[PDB]
Design an enzyme around this catalytic site. Structure first.
Site, mmCIF file in Angstrom:
data_model
loop_
_atom_site.group_PDB
_atom_site.id
_atom_site.type_symbol
_atom_site.label_atom_id
_atom_site.label_comp_id
_atom_site.label_asym_id
_atom_site.label_seq_id
_atom_site.Cartn_x
_atom_site.Cartn_y
_atom_site.Cartn_z
ATOM 1 N N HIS A 70 0.822 -1.218 0.000
ATOM 2 C CA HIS A 70 0.000 0.000 0.000
ATOM 3 C C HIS A 70 0.855 1.266 0.000
ATOM 4 C CE1 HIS A 70 -3.052 -2.948 1.454
ATOM 5 N NE2 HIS A 70 -3.782 -2.252 0.602
ATOM 6 N N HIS A 74 1.796 1.276 -5.702
ATOM 7 C CA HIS A 74 0.381 0.925 -5.821
ATOM 8 C C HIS A 74 -0.452 2.119 -6.273
ATOM 9 C CE1 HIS A 74 -3.500 -0.912 -4.993
ATOM 10 N NE2 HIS A 74 -3.768 -0.047 -4.028
ATOM 11 N N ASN A 231 -4.354 -6.096 -10.095
ATOM 12 C CA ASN A 231 -3.106 -6.858 -10.140
ATOM 13 C C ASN A 231 -3.258 -8.215 -10.835
ATOM 14 O OD1 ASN A 231 -2.043 -5.865 -6.775
ATOM 15 N ND2 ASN A 231 -2.131 -4.701 -8.705
#
Ligand SMILES: COc1c(OCc2ccc(F)cc2)cc2oc3cc4c(c(OC/C=C/C(=O)O)c3c(=O)c2c1CC=C(C)C)C=CC(C)(C)O4
Ligand SMILES: [Mg+2]
Ligand SMILES: [Zn+2]
Length: 320
Positions: A70, A74, A231
């Site tokens: 995170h 990202h 992802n």
């Protein structure tokens, strides 16, 4: 070289990790700057270039470099993925420049200052964040609070030349979008998207027809949610490094939970993990139902993305 890699900004599966290295750990600034130029948002909204860079760099600073998933990488990934989903033919000329701006801005701030643990962990440890936000979308309220507050730092108000109505409207849309990225809302968000696909209307040019705010924000909400859960749809060499990163962050939370005598959250127990089996689980129950629904919304624009997801699922399965 970096400029060369930033040429792929309109493509799914941009190599975001190389851009992070080639930019000196600034994937979020350079990708957002590239996208704003590509969409001509600086001219449309009279955003001084120096203000934009100054805000992006401050925003990137408030992602934690020592959190494995995170982080600013990202954030750049989700921005760029939202950027590509916004360009889908079935949505051509559907959204205004302001809505486009809202969804990209929302993507960039959507995890800022994430400390690397889940909402439930923050609730169960009686954290200051959970106390401030009354156990309700704790992280997501904080990401918004930080992302908007940084706009007020010196030379950071990238929205300084929007009208009052424009600012008000953008702010509300950004809030609506980021609060929807709370995973505990996934089922209700997907249920609404299924309903919209089943009653889907298209215009004379083939483009998706969105009559009202409710339909428009719900598509932007699911779009950023898809970007957040994208992802497994990316080329495998990218996907695998996201799995590595999420598992490191998860296992770290699980060590803290073990230390504190708490039950370890699902996928956080490194002495009882099954990485491959969980990715297959997560795709089958979460990622694929969502992406298959999005693919229906924009049919057939997302067929390659869904194909890549189905291959990656097959590959993870094959290693059990
Ligand atoms: C608790 O539920 C679960 C859960 O439950 C266990 C289970 C559920 C279903 C199943 F089939 C198997 C395991 C398993 C989960 O597995 C993930 C795997 C992941 C990633 C995840 O993050 C998504 C992005 C978050 C962000 O950007 O913030 C998640 C989740 O968020 C997650 C949640 C959701 C979180 C909640 C409800 C608090 C990200 C990257 C890849 C795909 C590489 O891997
Ligand atoms: Mg999040
Ligand atoms: Zn996220």
């Amino acid at each position: 070289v970096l400029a060369k890699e930033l040429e792929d900004v309109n493509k799914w599966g941009l190599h975001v990790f190389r851009i992070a290295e080639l930019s000196g750990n600034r994937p979020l600034t350079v990708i957002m700057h590239t996208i704003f130029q590509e969409r001509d948002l600086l001219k449309t909204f009279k955003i001084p270039v120096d203000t934009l860079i100054t805000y992006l760099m401050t925003l990137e600073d408030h992602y934690h470099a020592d959190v494995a998933y995170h982080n600013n990488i990202h954030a750049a990934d989700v921005v760029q993925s939202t950027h590509v989903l916004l360009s889908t033919p079935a949505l051509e000329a559907v959204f205004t420049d302001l809505e486009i701006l809202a969804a990209i801005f929302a993507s960039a701030i959507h995890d800022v200052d994430h400390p690397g643990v889940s909402n439930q962990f923050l609730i169960n440890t009686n954290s200051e964040l959970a106390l401030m936000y009354n156990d309700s979308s704790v992280l997501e309220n904080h990401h918004l609070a930080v992302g908007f507050k940084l706009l007020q730092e010196e030379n950071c108000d990238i929205f300084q030349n929007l009208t009052k109505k424009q600012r008000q409207s953008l702010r509300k849309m950004v809030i609506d979008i980021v609060l929807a990225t709370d995973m505990s809302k996934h089922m209700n968000l997907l249920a609404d998207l299924k309903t919209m696909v089943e009653t889907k209307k298209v215009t004379s040019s083939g483009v998706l027809l969105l009559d009202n705010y409710s339909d428009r924000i719900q598509v932007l909400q699911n779009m950023v949610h898809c970007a957040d859960l994208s992802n497994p749809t990316k080329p495998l060499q990218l996907y695998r490094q996201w799995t590595d990163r999420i598992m490191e962050e998860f296992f770290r939370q699980g060590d803290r939970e073990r230390e504190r005598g708490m039950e370890i959250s699902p996928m956080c127990d490194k002495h009882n993990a099954s990485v491959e089996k969980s990715q297959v689980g997560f795709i089958d129950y979460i990622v694929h139902p969502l992406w298959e629904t999005w693919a229906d919304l924009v049919h057939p624009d997302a067929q390659d993305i869904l194909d890549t997801l189905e291959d990656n699922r097959e590959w993870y399965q094959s290693t059990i």
